[PDB]
């Protein structure tokens with residue numbers, strides 16, 4: 251009953267088309283923030299630097315799946331906020347508008363509980379275990395492009411990884 | 417929350433990969449009968465004998481996970497004393513049986529702690545847990561193990577390196 255998601259450097263839009271499900275999104279909030287030392291180091295920008303923050307509800311066939319909050323350097327991508335009016339896929343926007351392509355990412359997987367707001371958005375009981383993911387991605391020139399923190403419904407997701415003995 | 421890269425390594429290797437000292441407690445070990453599910457996973461006949469091993473995993477002495485391992489009993493004679501000997505299942509597999517893991521599929525999910533798990537892990541019933549399953553095959557292409565582990569949600573995180581094909 252859970253979606254089985256392969257761990258791979260792919261977009262939510264790509265992932266849902268793999269599942270044969272229709273991906274839609276709801277822009278919960280978008281705008282600029284000032285980076286603290288942590289976010290500055292992750293995006294290789296000067297402390298105090300401006301960060302585009304994008305928060306989206308990701309749905310599969312109209313049902314809430316996850317809330318994703320993505321962070322990118324506003325200085326590098328000043329027209330990206332506006333460009334997302336035209337693109338549903340962030341990765342597609344980066345490729346077509348800025349010729350930026352992701353090459354490597356580190357993804358972290360943890361579990362914890364949703365905030366009251368998240369639980370309301372996802373339609374889950376607030377006591378439901380959730381899958382808390384982060385993704386730190388870099389492009390083909392080795393520059394960090396995004397830092398993403400996400401909350402995936404614990405009752406709808408499992409992740410799958412292929413392991414190899416080195 | 418302590419980090420741990422997803423790759424085909426043992427608990428022992430992963431712990432020594434950090435500065436953490438791995439210890440385990442053997443909770444139980446015994447034979448069960450395989451249902452169709454397990455029989456398929458281990459490539460034995462339904463009704464076949466499976467060795468189930470239950471271990472408590474500690475990092476620097478603090479309880480971290482309960483790990484339940486399933487293997488074909490017929491394939492691994494004297495596995496119990498061999499596990500006592502080497503402590504690492506993977507070391508035992510290599511040294512005793514000349515069995516070497518080549519590939520595995522790992523599943524990562526959430527769950528809630530059962531009363532048994534909460535008691536063993538010194539935590540609360542209903543604490544969010546990370547539930548990981550590993551299905552591994554050896555260099556002959558044969559499945560070796562099917563493992564299910566429950567990690568304290570407040571103490572563990574798993575890390576994966578992604579690269580675009």
Ligand SMILES: CC(=O)N[C@@H]1[C@@H](O)[C@H](O)[C@@H](COP(=O)(O)O)O[C@@H]1O
Pocket residue numbers: 260261262263264318320338339340341342357383384385396398399400
């Ligand atoms: C790691 C994670 O939880 N989600 C990633 C996220 O890092 C990325 O920003 C998004 C872009 O999807 P889009 O191109 O469809 O907007 O795809 C994935 O879902």
Ligand SMILES: CC(=O)N[C@@H]1[C@@H](O)[C@H](O)[C@@H](COP(=O)(O)O)O[C@H]1O
Pocket residue numbers: 425426427428429483485503504505506507522548549550561563564565
């Ligand atoms: C959920 C999982 O992947 N558990 C793996 C398990 O499949 C594997 O049998 C175990 C081996 O460790 P050991 O040699 O006993 O120290 O390492 C665990 O981490």
